[PDB]
């Protein structure tokens, strides 16, 4: 009876920016998501293919926990089927995405009165992007990687909303993560 | 949470030697370990940040290297005032926590 290391991705000091999101492959875990769901300190807990009370008792083989920092106004548009300034240049989901997206308000950490100029988002691209793909290419398009201008008093839609995106996946392999 | 084990618990050095120290973890962190030094009954200071860089006001022999999960603080040709208690604390996950502690003692 070993439990999955969710503490290394839910409890981190510096979440990476949106264009260079950290991916952590999870296998051979036991993941009790009732500790996550019944915390009630998250803002938007949307699920997109499993019911949020039903997700405990079914198995999987590998679940990817993507994680990044976006503006609060753009948390809704990382759902499937929506394309905006974020969801075609930085992180785009497929239309049959199987997983839950978890987000909360994080104005405590990532805010400075002069600015927090280190979270970067890819403003301009040559063409659009294929889902589940990243590109750290800081070449001239016009410098594309502008930073979020963050502040403690900027707007409840412009506070940094640290979002971790689960991604369940079941392939032709013996499923392990059941709980 | 991480716990940080320093080993060994004490040292015994003569002035002028090149002896290194050891701080090992229980999780794998991306070089987010710092290093503190506290003398007797006063406040500790910062020596190096992010386990490889260094700040001003520090003597040149105080340099650390190595990332991953096992980290070593390297001091060479020590001075007669560098002895005391030495600390390592990580900054990746929460809550923040410091090591148990070693004692640099001069023979």
């Amino acid at each position: 009876t070993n439990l999955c290391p969710f503490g290394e991705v839910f409890n981190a000091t510096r979440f990476a920016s949106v264009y260079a999101w950290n991916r952590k492959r999870i296998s051979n875990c036991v993941a009790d998501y009732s500790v996550l769901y019944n915390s009630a300190s998250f803002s938007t807990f949307k699920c997109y293919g499993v019911s949020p009370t039903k997700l405990n008792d079914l198995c999987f083989t590998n679940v990817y926990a993507d994680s990044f920092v976006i503006r609060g106004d753009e948390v809704r548009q990382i759902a499937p089927g929506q394309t905006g300034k974020i969801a075609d240049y930085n992180y785009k989901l497929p239309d049959d995405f199987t997983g839950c997206v978890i987000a909360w308000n994080s104005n405590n950490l990532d805010s400075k009165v002069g600015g927090n100029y280190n979270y970067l988002y890819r403003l301009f691209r040559k063409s659009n992007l294929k889902p589940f793909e990243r590109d750290i290419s800081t070449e001239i398009y016009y410098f594309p990687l502008q930073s979020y201008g963050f502040q403690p008093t900027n707007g409840v839609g412009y506070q940094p909303y640290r979002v971790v995106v689960l991604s369940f996946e079941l392939l032709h392999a013996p499923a392990t993560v059941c709980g | 949470d991480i716990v940080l084990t320093q080993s060994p618990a004490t040292l015994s050095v003569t002035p002028g030697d090149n002896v290194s120290l050891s701080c090992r973890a229980s999780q794998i962190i991306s070089n987010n370990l710092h290093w503190y030094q506290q003398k007797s009954h006063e406040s500790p200071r910062l020596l190096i940040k992010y386990a490889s860089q260094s700040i001003s006001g520090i003597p040149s022999r105080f340099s650390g290297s190595g990332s991953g999960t096992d980290f070593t603080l390297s001091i060479n040709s020590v001075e007669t005032e560098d002895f005391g208690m030495y600390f390592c604390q990580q900054s990746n996950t929460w809550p923040l926590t410091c090591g148990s502690g070693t004692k640099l003692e001069l023979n």
Partner: nanobody, 119 residues
Framework: QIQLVQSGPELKKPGETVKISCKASGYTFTDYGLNWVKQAPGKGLKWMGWINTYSGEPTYNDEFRGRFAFSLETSTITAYLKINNLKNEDTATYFC????????????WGAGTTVTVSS
């Protein structure tokens, strides 16, 4: 100069409530939050949780959940520590550390108040 001037020593009896001050100077107070460190004698340090230096909301550790409070007023540059229901084992020095809001290394420290409790 940049320093964190502290309060003096204390001596209480079990059942009282202490208020330890920690006043900053020099650097602008909004760029860097503050911390608290409890050094039990002959032991390692423990991080008592930080405080957001602008808004005033604390964030405690998972071990110092009850019986603690991180008050703050910003008219004068002064942050408090309030300890409720003092017991026999809380006798330690209590530094306050200027840990940043983007780095979390305790760069510039204070002096520390060696509080003691006795019957």
């Amino acid at each position: 100069q940049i320093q964190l001037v502290q309060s003096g020593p204390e001596l209480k009896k079990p059942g009282e409530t202490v208020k330890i001050s920690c006043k900053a100077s020099g650097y602008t107070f909004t760029d860097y939050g503050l911390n608290w460190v409890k050094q039990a004698p002959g032991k390692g340090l423990k991080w008592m949780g930080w405080i957001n230096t602008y808004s005033g909301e604390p964030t405690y550790n998972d071990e110092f959940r009850g019986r603690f409070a991180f008050s703050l007023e910003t008219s004068t540059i002064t942050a408090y520590l309030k300890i409720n229901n003092l017991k026999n084992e809380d006798t330690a020095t209590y530094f306050c550390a200027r840990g940043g809001n983007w780095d979390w290394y305790f760069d510039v420290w204070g002096a520390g108040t060696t509080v003691t409790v006795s019957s």
